Structure formats: structure tokens, C-alpha cells
């Protein structure tokens, strides 16, 4: 409705209606969905991904890293006024904004192996803070990185600091990334700070013809 394709996949709190959708025939998106990246930022190869959706008819959402499994990091403190759910300021439902526990931020080394039979859409992100101060306030370690690996992926992301105009009240930025993890293959993350980790990911349950229509209209009870 008022959600965007990004909003839906990342699971903006305002898009909860779409947390777990049944097979579809086409997707319909408004010209300017009100509920998109509540926390300002950017979605990498966003168009190339949308193109991938034009060939998919069904996701089944699965958990690949439980929120509860983050022992040596705060997972529940990862929330923002830029993403209100209902008063209580919130965050993207499908990814965790991990933050320092005690005074510290241990190197994360987590990996998921795709024991499923179908291709898997995996999402994650990086936080770009305002200054060294905020960097150090939230994560501890001042010089950070996120490394991600697949049989095909060789990514090392590095947070980028800069003073920027506020958007939805945040001068910070969030930058999300994605990959398709083939069956029997694994994805290995490693990070030391500014990591926005996966919780939920999407199985490509069936592939076929579809499209992303741009229409302001709503469902008509017809065929």
C-alpha cells in the first residue's frame, strides 16, 4: 500500500501487514510510498534487485540468524526515532542493529549454510555515523569494517563518516546490501562494528512471470 519494495523486504515497521505473504501474481507499488527507508540511507543495486523480483512469484521468509543468539552484543538497543512503530521508536524488522555490550564490541564471526533446496535472498547493512564521537558512543572500536563472503561474493564494507543534512531527523545513514545464496553454499560475515546483521531472509520458493506495476489503485475483487 504505502510500502515500497525496499520497505517490504527490509521490513519497515509500518509495513507489518506484509510480513509473510502467500504466492502473488504481480506486485503493485505506488509512485511515492510513504513507508520506505524510515531511517535514511540507500539500497545497493536496488533496481537490479527489483529486476530479480520481476521473475519471482513467492517468498517464504526464514530465520537464518536468530535475534536471541547475539550473546556478546546488545541486540535490543538497536532502535531509532526515525522508525516509529507506535510511539515507542523502532527499526527494520528483518535486520538487527547490533550495538556494544558492556563497554565493548567483540569481533563477530557468524555464518549460515543454505541447507535448503532453493536460492536464498539474504539482506544486511552498514551504519554510517555522523562523527568519531557517535562512532565511539555506539560501537567502540574506531576503525571498523564488515566482511562478507560467498562462493561468489568478496565484500568488505567500511563505514564512511561525513556531516550530512537531517532526513527523518537523522544525520546518519544506513546502507543495505544483498546477495543470492545458492543452495548448499554459505555466507560468512565478519565484523568489528557498524554491522547491521540479518535476522530474517527470503527463500525463493517459486519462480515465474510477474512484474512491478506502478499504480495508485487498490484491489478490485475481480479476475
Amino acid at each position: 500500500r504505502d510500502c515500497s519494495v525496499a520497505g517490504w523486504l527490509l521490513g519497515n515497521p509500518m509495513c507489518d501487514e506484509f510480513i509473510n505473504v502467500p504466492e502473488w501474481s504481480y506486485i503493485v507499488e505506488k509512485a511515492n510510498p510513504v513507508n520506505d527507508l524510515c531511517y535514511p540511507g540507500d539500497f545497493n543495486d536496488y533496481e537490479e534487485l527489483k529486476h530479480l523480483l520481476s521473475r519471482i512469484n513467492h517468498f517464504e521468509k526464514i530465520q537464518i540468524i536468530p535475534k536471541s543468539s547475539w550473546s556478546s552484543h546488545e541486540a535490543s538497543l538497536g532502535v531509532s526515532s526515525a522508525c516509529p512503530y507506535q510511539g515507542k521508536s523502532s527499526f527494520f524488522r528483518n535486520v538487527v542493529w547490533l550495538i556494544k555490550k558492556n563497554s565493548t564490541y567483540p569481533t563477530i564471526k557468524r555464518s549460515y549454510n543454505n541447507t535448503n533446496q532453493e536460492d536464498l535472498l539474504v539482506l544486511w547493512g552498514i551504519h554510517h555515523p555522523n562523527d568519531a564521537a557517535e562512532q565511539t558512543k555506539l560501537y567502540q572500536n574506531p576503525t571498523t569494517y564488515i566482511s562478507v563472503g560467498t562462493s561468489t561474493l568478496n565484500q568488505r564494507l567500511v563505514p564512511r563518516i561525513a556531516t550530512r543534512s537531517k532526513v527523518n531527523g537523522q544525520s546518519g545513514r544506513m546502507e543495505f546490501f544483498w546477495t543470492i545464496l545458492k543452495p548448499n553454499d554459505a555466507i560468512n560475515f565478519e565484523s568489528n562494528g557498524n554491522f547491521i546483521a540479518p535476522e530474517y531472509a527470503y527463500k525463493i520458493v517459486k519462480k515465474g512471470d510477474s512484474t512491478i506495476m506502478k499504480s495508485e489503485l487498490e484491489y478490485g475483487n475481480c479476475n
Partner: antibody, heavy 120, light 112 residues
Framework: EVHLQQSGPELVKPGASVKMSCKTS????????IHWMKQSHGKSLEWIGG????????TYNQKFKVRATLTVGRSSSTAYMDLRSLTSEDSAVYYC?????????????WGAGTTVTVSS | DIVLTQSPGSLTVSLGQRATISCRAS??????????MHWYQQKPGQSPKLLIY???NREFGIPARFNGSGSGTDFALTINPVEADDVATYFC?????????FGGGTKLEIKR
């Protein structure tokens, strides 16, 4: 969540009328047709009707055309059914159910069940 | 009316085995290339539950033990392996053509 909260169990004198309600919550009322199902105590499911909130179009079963009346309160996010001039026949359970898409759709979210008892 | 007739009426199957419930439609329920059949599960003492839509695909949060199969005039819900919490009456219902019609229903019992 997709919860459907419906009316509490009811008793009606034979010949009278009932109006059980079903309150929608958790999704957009106006995107899906709501329907009613009757189940003769531990036997078989019968389809009564359907109504699409957004404009109030109704679709009835032959059997219930007369005795039944689906209505919708858009501000209330609520669907109502009304059974007029009852008999022992109508003593059974009534489910307020959300059907997914149109004429060719599956009922995915079923409500609790308002159970009606017709006796003097 | 598309009369839906399920068979058998009652089925008792040993634990850890295969339950095989059938559905038969008076006329086809099968155009646009897809079957418009649905399976529903009513665990005792509560409202029915959605298992399979358009005869073959599982609704989210349904274990793989449920095999939706069939095309045209006859279908089959296959539960295998049968678990403990599978005592229920199972219903098939067609959406191909109003008025929406359901099956008689099949009650499943566990041999222990």
C-alpha cells in the same frame, strides 16, 4: 497479526432474529472480502456469503439468500451478519472468515466461531 | 453447485505412517491451468485451519508432512509421516465456482 474477534454465543427464540458481529484487526479491512460459514454441529461446512468492505458488495449462497444479510461498518472495521426468522435448523456455529482473493480464493484466516442456540 | 465428496469418511492410521484422504468433484474445479481446491484442518474443539491453497501449495507455517496433490476432478491430501497432533477432521473446498462448496470432511484417528 490477522485476528478476527467475533460476537459471543447467542440464544434466540424460534422466529426471532440474531445479529452476530465480527471485528477485523491487523490488516486493511478494505482489501479483502469477508465471508460467513455455518457448521451444523459436527457435520459439514456450508458457505453463507461474502461482502467486500470497501464498497459493500455482497455475494450470497442460494440457501441463505433470504435469511441472511451481510453488512459492513467501515469506520468500525467490522463485518456483521444477520439471520432473520430462525428455526432449529439454524442452531449451529457461525464463522466469520477472511477469504484471500476474489471469486477464486481461499479462506486463510478463520475467526473463533459465534455459536447460536435456538430454543424457547 | 459443484458437489464435493471426500473419501473415506473416517480414517484410522498408525502413528508414523501415511494418511491419504481423497476428494472428488462433480464437475472440474480446474481452469486457468490451476486447480482451485483447498484443504482445511479442524483440530477438535476449534475453528478450521488453512492447510493447502489451489490444491498443491502449503500455507505459510505448515509442515512438509502435508502433501497436496491432484488435478481436475479428484485430489488428495497426503499426510506422511502422521504425527500425534494430527487428529482432526480435514476438509476440501472448491473456489472455482460459486456457490463455494465444501467436502463432507474426513476425520483422522491415530492408532497407538
Amino acid at each position: 497479526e490477522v485476528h478476527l474477534q467475533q460476537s459471543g454465543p447467542e440464544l434466540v427464540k424460534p422466529g426471532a432474529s440474531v445479529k452476530m458481529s465480527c471485528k477485523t484487526s491487523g490488516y486493511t479491512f478494505t482489501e479483502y472480502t469477508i465471508h460467513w460459514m455455518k457448521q451444523s454441529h459436527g457435520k459439514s461446512l456450508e458457505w453463507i456469503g461474502g461482502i467486500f468492505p470497501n464498497n459493500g458488495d455482497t455475494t450470497y449462497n442460494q440457501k441463505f439468500k433470504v435469511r441472511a444479510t451481510l453488512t459492513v461498518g467501515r469506520s468500525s472495521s467490522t463485518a456483521y451478519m444477520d439471520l432473520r426468522s430462525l428455526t432449529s435448523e439454524d442452531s449451529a456455529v457461525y464463522y466469520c472468515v477472511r477469504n484471500y482473493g476474489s471469486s477464486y480464493g481461499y479462506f486463510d484466516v478463520w475467526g473463533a466461531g459465534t455459536t447460536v442456540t435456538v430454543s424457547s | 453447485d459443484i458437489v464435493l465428496t471426500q473419501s473415506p469418511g473416517s480414517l484410522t492410521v498408525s502413528l508414523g505412517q501415511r494418511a491419504t484422504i481423497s476428494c472428488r468433484a462433480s464437475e472440474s474445479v480446474d481452469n486457468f491451468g490451476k486447480s482451485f481446491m483447498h484443504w482445511y484442518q479442524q483440530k477438535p474443539g476449534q475453528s478450521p485451519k488453512l492447510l493447502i491453497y489451489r490444491a498443491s501449495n502449503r500455507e505459510f507455517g505448515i509442515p512438509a508432512r502435508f502433501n497436496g496433490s491432484g488435478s481436475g476432478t479428484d485430489f488428495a491430501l497426503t499426510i506422511n509421516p502422521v504425527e500425534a497432533d494430527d487428529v482432526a477432521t480435514y476438509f476440501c473446498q472448491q473456489s472455482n465456482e460459486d456457490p463455494r462448496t465444501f467436502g463432507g470432511g474426513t476425520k483422522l484417528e491415530i492408532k497407538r
